[PDB]
């Protein structure tokens, strides 16, 4: 059964920096594009980045300063080092797969499959 | 006063009902041609 | 109806616009399969239940 599960959020301090992970199951990386989103408490889905199969990177161009999205084939699981995470930082962050092949019907988002997501808070303490 | 009906004693799995508007010495005469063609 | 217990009702015989369904801002998921939503309007269905 194809399953996206993340781990790795939590408590993080300003301006430092955290590494997220989605560990894949199901699937592997060496066909597929896998985008991260981010979700807000008051707003909606906001597109992060996508990691194509043969490496390449894009990001959300007001976003770029601060993400890095890398793979580990050997791990099948996908990385997500972010610096600097400030008050609106704080997200619950999905990893999903993006849908290039045959869609049954008008997608908003365009994914096949979704991940839980984890969920990053930054405050004080 | 109709107060008999005795044709079925089931009614199972339905696939199509409609409800329409009645078609009808010997005074009438009452032609009907049935075909099955193509379903 | 409960979920175990899930009504079904036949539509039938009868002319159904599915452009009110599509563009409806009610339903948050709205996924079809075989068929795209905008071309619903275009086919003519049959055994159709809810
Ligand atoms: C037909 O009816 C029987 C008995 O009511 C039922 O077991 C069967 O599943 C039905 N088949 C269909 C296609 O509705």
């Known amino acids: 059964e194809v399953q996206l599960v993340e781990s790795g959020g939590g408590l993080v301090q300003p301006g430092g920096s955290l590494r997220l992970s989605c560990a894949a199951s199901?699937?592997?990386?060496?066909?597929?594009?896998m985008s991260w989103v981010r979700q807000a408490p008051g707003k909606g889905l906001e597109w992060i980045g996508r990691?194509?199969?043969?490496?390449?990177?894009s990001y959300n161009p007001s976003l770029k300063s601060l993400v890095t999205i890398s793979r580990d084939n050997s791990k099948n699981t996908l990385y997500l080092q972010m610096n600097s995470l400030r008050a609106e930082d704080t997200a619950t962050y999905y990893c999903?797969?993006?849908?290039?092949?045959?869609?049954?019907?008008?997608?908003?988002?365009?994914?096949?499959?979704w991940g839980q997501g984890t969920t990053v808070t930054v405050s004080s303490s | 006063m109709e107060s008999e009906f005795r044709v079925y004693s089931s009614a199972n799995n339905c696939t199509f009902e409609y409800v329409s508007q009645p078609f009808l010495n010997f005074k009438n005469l009452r032609e009907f041609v049935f075909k099955n063609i193509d379903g | 109806a409960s979920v175990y217990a899930w009504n079904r009702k036949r539509i039938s015989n009868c002319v159904a616009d599915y452009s009110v369904l599509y563009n409806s801002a009610s339903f948050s998921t709205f996924k079809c399969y075989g068929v795209s939503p905008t071309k619903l309007n275009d086919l003519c269905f049959t055994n159709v239940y809810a």
């Open positions: 199901g699937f592997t990386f060496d066909d597929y594009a």
């Open positions: 990691m194509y199969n043969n490496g390449r990177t």
């Open positions: 999903a797969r993006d849908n290039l092949g045959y869609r049954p019907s008008e997608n908003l988002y365009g994914m096949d499959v």
